[PDB]
Amino acid sequence: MCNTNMSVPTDGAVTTSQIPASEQETLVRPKPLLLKLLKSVGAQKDTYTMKEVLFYLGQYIMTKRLYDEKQQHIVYCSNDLLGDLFGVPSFSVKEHRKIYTMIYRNLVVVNQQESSDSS
What we know:
Layout lengths: L34 H7 L10 H11 L11 E2 L5 H5 L5 E2 L3 H8 L16
């Protein structure tokens, strides 16, 4: 993927997008799990976003030598920090939809304090 700058309306569908990590960002703030994930590669923040975690979690997978050896999409993670994410012996990063949707198991998004008007 290097000739992709505006996509192609020929045998390539409309858009190569899918998964909430840029279009649906969220100023993510998880518990020690995605930060032991990203802060490892190089990250270092009090919070993150699904966009940072997007390309960054992409980093840690491809890195730390946990990936397959066919097309770098069957990334085996036995006893790995990537494992703390879910816990698979292998996961398909190629399908970022299912891979990141199982990343966020329960729930975790931006907080943004609010007020009950009269309080």
